[PDB]
Write a protein that holds these residues in place. Structure first.
Motif, PDB file in Angstrom:
ATOM      1  N   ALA A 108       6.227  13.978  -2.970  1.00 40.21           N
ATOM      2  CA  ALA A 108       6.082  12.687  -2.316  1.00 40.21           C
ATOM      3  C   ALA A 108       6.451  11.277  -2.973  1.00 40.21           C
ATOM      4  O   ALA A 108       6.055  11.122  -3.911  1.00 40.21           O
ATOM      5  N   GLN A 109       7.375  10.559  -2.269  1.00 41.99           N
ATOM      6  CA  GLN A 109       7.826   9.260  -2.931  1.00 41.99           C
ATOM      7  C   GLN A 109       7.615   8.141  -1.955  1.00 41.99           C
ATOM      8  O   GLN A 109       7.919   8.460  -0.875  1.00 41.99           O
ATOM      9  N   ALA A 110       7.058   6.983  -2.431  1.00 45.02           N
ATOM     10  CA  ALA A 110       6.709   5.772  -1.601  1.00 45.02           C
ATOM     11  C   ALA A 110       7.351   4.687  -2.135  1.00 45.02           C
ATOM     12  O   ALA A 110       7.343   4.317  -3.359  1.00 45.02           O
ATOM     13  N   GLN A 111       8.274   4.040  -1.423  1.00 45.56           N
ATOM     14  CA  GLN A 111       8.979   2.776  -2.047  1.00 45.56           C
ATOM     15  C   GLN A 111       8.584   1.470  -0.678  1.00 45.56           C
ATOM     16  O   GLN A 111       8.763   1.550   0.272  1.00 45.56           O
ATOM     17  N   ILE A 112       8.133   0.608  -1.539  1.00 46.80           N
ATOM     18  CA  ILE A 112       7.822  -0.689  -0.617  1.00 46.80           C
ATOM     19  C   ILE A 112       8.456  -1.910  -1.262  1.00 46.80           C
ATOM     20  O   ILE A 112       8.765  -2.238  -2.172  1.00 46.80           O
ATOM     21  N   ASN A 113       9.408  -2.455  -0.242  1.00 54.00           N
ATOM     22  CA  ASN A 113      10.149  -3.699  -0.327  1.00 54.00           C
ATOM     23  C   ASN A 113       9.644  -4.795   0.267  1.00 54.00           C
ATOM     24  O   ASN A 113       9.654  -4.871   1.396  1.00 54.00           O
ATOM     25  N   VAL A 144       3.276 -14.187   5.303  1.00 56.68           N
ATOM     26  CA  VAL A 144       2.449 -13.040   4.821  1.00 56.68           C
ATOM     27  C   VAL A 144       3.375 -11.568   4.970  1.00 56.68           C
ATOM     28  O   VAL A 144       4.012 -11.556   6.039  1.00 56.68           O
ATOM     29  N   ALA A 145       3.309 -10.807   3.966  1.00 60.50           N
ATOM     30  CA  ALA A 145       4.265  -9.603   3.913  1.00 60.50           C
ATOM     31  C   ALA A 145       3.337  -8.370   3.549  1.00 60.50           C
ATOM     32  O   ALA A 145       2.751  -8.333   2.449  1.00 60.50           O
ATOM     33  N   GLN A 146       3.021  -7.553   4.290  1.00 57.68           N
ATOM     34  CA  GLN A 146       2.408  -6.267   4.197  1.00 57.68           C
ATOM     35  C   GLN A 146       3.206  -5.098   4.327  1.00 57.68           C
ATOM     36  O   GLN A 146       3.763  -4.887   5.221  1.00 57.68           O
ATOM     37  N   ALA A 147       3.060  -4.056   3.350  1.00 63.81           N
ATOM     38  CA  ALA A 147       3.696  -2.689   3.682  1.00 63.81           C
ATOM     39  C   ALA A 147       2.810  -1.754   3.236  1.00 63.81           C
ATOM     40  O   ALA A 147       2.040  -1.663   2.621  1.00 63.81           O
ATOM     41  N   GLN A 148       2.774  -0.800   4.400  1.00 63.04           N
ATOM     42  CA  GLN A 148       2.138   0.503   4.345  1.00 63.04           C
ATOM     43  C   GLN A 148       2.856   1.682   4.429  1.00 63.04           C
ATOM     44  O   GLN A 148       3.736   2.049   5.360  1.00 63.04           O
ATOM     45  N   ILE A 149       2.698   2.502   3.329  1.00 61.29           N
ATOM     46  CA  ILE A 149       3.297   4.118   3.452  1.00 61.29           C
ATOM     47  C   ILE A 149       2.375   5.150   3.234  1.00 61.29           C
ATOM     48  O   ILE A 149       1.645   5.120   2.380  1.00 61.29           O
ATOM     49  N   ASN A 150       2.514   6.140   4.327  1.00 62.14           N
ATOM     50  CA  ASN A 150       1.679   7.275   4.321  1.00 62.14           C
ATOM     51  C   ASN A 150       2.634   8.509   4.462  1.00 62.14           C
ATOM     52  O   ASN A 150       3.417   8.781   4.998  1.00 62.14           O
ATOM     53  N   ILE A 151       2.252   9.103   3.046  1.00 64.93           N
ATOM     54  CA  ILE A 151       2.857  10.267   2.793  1.00 64.93           C
ATOM     55  C   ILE A 151       2.268  11.061   1.646  1.00 64.93           C
ATOM     56  O   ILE A 151       3.070  11.588   0.935  1.00 64.93           O
ATOM     57  N   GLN A 179       0.929  -1.448  -0.144  1.00 61.70           N
ATOM     58  CA  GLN A 179       0.154  -0.067  -0.024  1.00 61.70           C
ATOM     59  C   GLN A 179       0.809   1.336  -0.076  1.00 61.70           C
ATOM     60  O   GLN A 179       1.826   1.177   1.038  1.00 61.70           O
ATOM     61  N   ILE A 180       0.831   1.918  -0.925  1.00 60.63           N
ATOM     62  CA  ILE A 180       1.432   3.440  -1.137  1.00 60.63           C
ATOM     63  C   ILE A 180       0.457   4.377  -1.078  1.00 60.63           C
ATOM     64  O   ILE A 180      -0.451   4.614  -1.948  1.00 60.63           O
ATOM     65  N   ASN A 181       0.796   5.414  -0.056  1.00 61.36           N
ATOM     66  CA  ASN A 181       0.017   6.781  -0.108  1.00 61.36           C
ATOM     67  C   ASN A 181       0.761   7.870  -0.308  1.00 61.36           C
ATOM     68  O   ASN A 181       1.713   8.131   0.544  1.00 61.36           O
ATOM     69  N   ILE A 182       0.808   8.424  -1.398  1.00 55.55           N
ATOM     70  CA  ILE A 182       1.531   9.918  -1.752  1.00 55.55           C
ATOM     71  C   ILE A 182       0.766  10.569  -2.914  1.00 55.55           C
ATOM     72  O   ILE A 182       1.419  11.307  -3.882  1.00 55.55           O
TER      73      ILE A 182
END
Lengths: 8, 8, 8, 8, 8, 8, 8, 8, 8, 8
Positions: free
Chosen positions: J2-7, I1-8, G5-8
Motif C-alpha cells: 500500500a502506497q500513499a502519495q499526497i501532492n 487551504v489545501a487538504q489531502a486525504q488518502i485511504n488505503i 493525511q496518509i492511510n496505508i
RNA sequence: GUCA
C-alpha cells in the motif's frame, strides 16, 4: 500552518 | 508552525 | 514552532 | 532495522 | 525494516 | 518494510 | 494552511 | 510493504 | 487551504 | 503493498 | 507551506 500525518 | 507525524 | 514526531 | 530522521 | 523521514 | 516521508 | 493525511 | 509520501 | 486525504 | 502519495 |  503545515501538518503532515503518515499512517503505516 | 509545522508539525510532522510519522507512524511506523 | 516546529515539532517532529517519529514512531518506529 | 529502524532508522529515525528528524529535520527541524 | 522501518524508516522515518521528517522535513520541517 | 514501511517507509514514511514528510515534506513540510 | 496545508494538511496531509496518509492511510496505508 | 507500505510507503507514505506527503508533499506540503 | 489545501487538504489531502488518502485511504488505503 | 500500500502506497500513499499526497501532492499539495 | 504561511515555524521561534
Amino acid at each position: 500552518v503545515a501538518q503532515a500525518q503518515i499512517n503505516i
